[model samples]
Target: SQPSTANGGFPSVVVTAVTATTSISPDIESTWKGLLAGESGIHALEDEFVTKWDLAVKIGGHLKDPVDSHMGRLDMRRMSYVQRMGKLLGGQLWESAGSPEVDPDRFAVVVGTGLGGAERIVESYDLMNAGGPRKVSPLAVQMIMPNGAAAVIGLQLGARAGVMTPVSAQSSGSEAIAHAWRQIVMGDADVAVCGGVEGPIEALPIAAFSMMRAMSTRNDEPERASRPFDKDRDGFVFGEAGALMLIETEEHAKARGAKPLARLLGAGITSDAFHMVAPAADGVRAGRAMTRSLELAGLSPADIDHVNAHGTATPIGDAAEANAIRVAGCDQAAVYAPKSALGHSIGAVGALESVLTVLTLRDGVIPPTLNYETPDPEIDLDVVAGEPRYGDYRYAVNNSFGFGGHNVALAFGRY
Candidate 1:
């Protein structure tokens, strides 16, 4: 529902600040530049990984730089990987905004992840199996909690309004941003630090995903593995990432002399409820979510200039998203999948690409999709390839689909 002005009307919701660190790179602009430049972040598997499970696939989007909060050793040991990345991203986002002017009571945190503290969970289970319950780490529970990122960021920002985390698989991160937008619309908070964090890099998951055949096995050409919408496309590659954005009402941001980067025009979240790890082959349900987003954003298919597709490079996944775009009646929009360059960040992918969507609108340029050689006839969207395409566009959309049939669309507007 739209906020009304009759009773302390909430100001127009807008994205004021944003930051992200992806597997290929750190910092938002650098990542954006690299994507536009058609850079690949995927790397060949390491020796240790080969020894572990005799990995079927030997490629992924690995973050080269280590994450550090610079906290004391004890504090660091207490926090999980997701929590640490959340704290780091939250701090950087705050600093990027010059530490915005906001009230503690009116602030909120809504960072989400797909598999929270997976590494810790796996490690603790191993310890318990070897010995007993006493062998498990004392901090395992808190560290592995799904709300760890939200709670940690809340404490970091001193936010008391609400701390939430939506674990809708891959849509978790983008859903967090959508939830924050809803919070502002419903007057639940004046400002929100919202985004997603994911640290699913672990030996157990690697083996599990490989066994499921959900990962790309092209070890010879790691950089060219994630070829979304291509005829030879196989499956996704894993990556770790963290993304955070500050959203506030236009009046609130303007009151503090803060400039708006883009408008959080609308957010649409739906469920397929048809399958648990597979998207609708026909894209009927996915198209509904996109159409709903357009209605809420007060725009038509003709108004959309670009679409950040949820193309995961899987044979079925890319086909479904392509049909969804066409079914939503927005096949005219320039479409590109950032995963071609950044690999799949799982839960953090949606929010990470949302940041890139904002930049795409601001810069009037569509980033190139890497590893796109031969096109798939089944997918008939105008996928941007070869080079970054420049255009003066106004409206754009970010699409994210997760396991368990969750679909989320975030509409962004360049004002």
Candidate 2:
């Protein structure tokens, strides 16, 4: 017989809640709300590199210290940049969820980052070369591992059941959410904290992007850098950060009576085997992922009103994703890219933006892509432009594609 536990005999594993996501972007809700009103955040900047490019579209998602600054001065000194971001996002999420009191055995944390702390490792190793072992911090190795961010999160939360990391480049962020959903639904853990972080803003990654021609060369105008879907769009913007969420089962949420913000809805992932750097171009495979995500959520493309594009502002990537959306039967969806305004933050972009989507879904308003000027004759879709629109957005999806031909689509309908 089941020992009638103090809290009814509900399944030990279940997810009942999601806390409010506190976000810190470049502008305030008032000044920049216009950007989401379908206006362009992309513009030229005076950054060292942008000044050199012929017609640089320098724009991207930029985050301010906001509360993160205060939180940083205190707990951030002890960790690497990525680790600090992970803990930073997870910390806020845990706090928002009322910091439920649960058994350590029933907790878990999963943080993803494609570049990990490679930049930190490279820079510190340079220091060791010139400064000697005595100069190198003993915590260097701990900081370099891909799992370090997730580990630090568990350390901060005192979670011990399991801690995991996923380093799937652009897909790292969305995969983190999918995996966390699995843990809660599979009965592995009753509560899970998950998201992603990235901090490799070094020259090497930039040099790699330069080689691949994947990054935007909009050097002249730093502000209007990442111009997705715009005829003038060249490539993606280089950026970095962290984003996370706290999840618990519905019954557990009811037991503790936590507020459920939104359902995980559904998630689907796939890849294009055609090329390492290039997508399959047909978008059939990615379209399937989108279709699967909708099926999982018990919705259809017609039900979806918005799409947050992977729109890295790349010439080919945007076209491929646009084709995929069209094939997925998302004809009426209003596609947009907040990253178009602040630049791409690499591994953590999707995770951070997903937080924005959650807010968008809740607030009943979606942010728009920044530098959308001359429409690319190649892609055809009703994209949010000049301003944010209002009408139907009860359902939506987000796309995140990376190098190595990785394609991921997650459905996040309003609940």
Candidate 3:
């Protein structure tokens, strides 16, 4: 059965501008430079809460500078850290796109998060325990809601089409991008601001993940802790970051004379239904996601030149993903793992890696993966390491898998 289409055919979606605030830097340009130089952003925790609680994991990918440094004290008090970061990146993305004159009614905002306002929730609990119920602020609910980040961006931009938030654990950001792409292709909206944000690098979160044995415990050498695809890899390092991208239909972009960064050609989303936290060992569904993305883009595996891997440095996760890559017939593609340097930002990691993938397509250079000294025999892929690799590549894939069996693959082409 043919699906009815308002525009007769799918519209071409292109990314116009991208912005991100990660542990290495606040802007995309500086962060991309640091990534190419293979600089690690993970550091030892010096927060009073971590020391007071005596958490087992003492290292994480914390932001180098305060995200709310430019905000007023009142605004900071009103919004959570995640919301502030989302707003900052959203504004940055809009300004980067030249503040395009688009219809507000057709503008959409979709920002995803894994743990929204978790730190604020913990703080409110502490406040109530110390004093009374009255100690909690009246804006507690607004500050702790998962949709707060998306709502903040929507309010700032006056997005009338929709302000959506996808909470698919770590895949939330990539899923949000996929959702926005659907809106544009279905003729629901013309322009969209979408990505992911996460701010939960707190003592409680660290303790929780440490209990699960999901985080790296290499406290002595923080810089070398996250070793993706390495033989001696331990676990992923927790991180907090926000990344936003401004995407629009090709016709709208051309009408406004906006230059394209890259073409968001296709996206595939799947679920394992196997485990809540662990990935399926067979990697069948994960491989299907990549194949589906390639099919949607009308491209073959041979057309793909590189892969921005979701290499969190976890043992089972990395092995399963490697198998999936081979199953998708992308074994020959050069793999670049950014988590080795930026750590794993959970929901925000996918968007951040997607931004890096776009830059890779634009610059025709693949950033090196840090601390990949000994390659795992099981994951026998061409992992770019030591230094950046330059090539005139046309297409690349970005993979993101979440805890709840969620898998997402995004395909991009050079513009």
Candidate 4:
């Protein structure tokens, strides 16, 4: 029999299992432990590349050959780096959950990427300009699409119900998770595979971000460069990661004898419409998003146990978010910034951070925000630092704000 519609407006969604491949660790367990231990994932860029480009920012969180997925030579040649990562990540998540056998029509996939295949596009253009049109690879167009990661994951998993790609800048990954919850509540799919991936560790994008002064210039100490919530923080460091989660209706999960890691209780999606790259002056919109998430979850400020902040380590962005958290009445919540250790994965940060949040709920420990030795006067929140905080909390919020004014808050509850 097929699944029935919920009597309520939305059905309950639960996270069964999660997976990730990041600069810090190759698997989800290692990533969470290493993150909580305050280990830095960033590394110094090679001397040759930095000297060749004459780059200002010489550090990044680069994933060092983590892929172990095997494919045909043809598929390997055609697939982009993000697509391969997604395919591998999707496989891992599915296998971790025992690979539930489900109908293709009852499955869906949502993947997010901020700057997908940007390097390939630039490389293809260079080849075309240098030689002739035939000099470019035939797979160039396929690889450069923003939806390529989602598309490849959908293909590999045989998810035929729907395939969605949300490219809302840094919020894209978190947005993908929220959208997956929406789809399940709407009865669009019984099960969904969703998350975010990022592969913008290339030359051109790095150069552009450097030009805009959006990257940290702490070349000597790459590991300590991304110091969020600290007074001495500079800017975010670019990171590459692929994070994924498998979600389904609670009934579906139970019927399949799957144990849920955490419950996706509520979500709030809002827009600032104020600036292209900067946060609004008052942070009213962002505050509203957090409040709305709590309201949807039937929770209040006091019910929130911890906050996984979108701490980009930027001056204005962190300041705006701190005020927003204060306005949202989340000042008392134990706040932690994963970017302090993992750097900014951009589109993948939200989903990757969500994985950690789920683990936090399951384990009842909040990871510390790295390098928060000195707090910023503008930020008045209770940020966890130095060591992890152990607590028996029920609910946590993962907040993400993108470059294009996209603000998302996902409320996760212990199940």
TM-scores for all candidates: the values are 0.95, 0.84, 0.95, 0.95
In model 1, which runs have C-alpha deviations exceeding 4 angstroms? 1-11, 68-72, 129-131
Model 1 C-alpha lDDT per residue in residues 1-415, reported as the tens digit of each score: 6433213333577788899887767778888888877888888877585766677877787775657634468757888888888888888899988797689788988987988877778789998999989999888998989898889999988898899999888888789999998887787888899989988465777787778788998889988999999999989988767889998888888888888888778788888878889998888888888887777777787989999998889999999898888888989999989889888888788998888888888888988898889989999889999999999879888999999999999888895
Best by lDDT: 3
- Supply the TM-score for candidate 1: 0.95
Per-residue lDDT tens digits for candidate 2, residues 224-335, read: 6677888888888765456777766666777887765555666777878888778778888888888877776667778888888888888888888888988899956888
Supply the global lDDT for candidate 1: 0.84
Tens digits of per-residue lDDT, candidate 4, 1-415, equal: 3231222446778899899888887788988888778788899887476779888888988774556345567656787778878878888888999988988798999989987877688789899899979999988988999899999889898999899998889999899998888888787898999999987476777787888788899889888898887898889988778899999988899999999999887788999999999988678899888888777667788888889999999889899899888878888888889898888888899999888889989999988788787888888788888898999868899999998898999899898
The segments of candidate 2 whose C-alpha lies over 4 angstroms from its true place after superposition are 1-62, 66-78, 131-136
Error of 2 at 93 (Å): 2.1
| Candidate scoring better on lDDT of 1 and 2 | 1
Global fold similarity of model 4 (TM-score)? 0.95
Worst 10 residues of 3 by lDDT: 1-10
TM-score of 2: 0.84
Provide the lowest-lDDT 10-residue window in model 1: 2-11
Q: Candidate 4: where is the Cα deviation over 4 Å? A: 1-9, 68-72
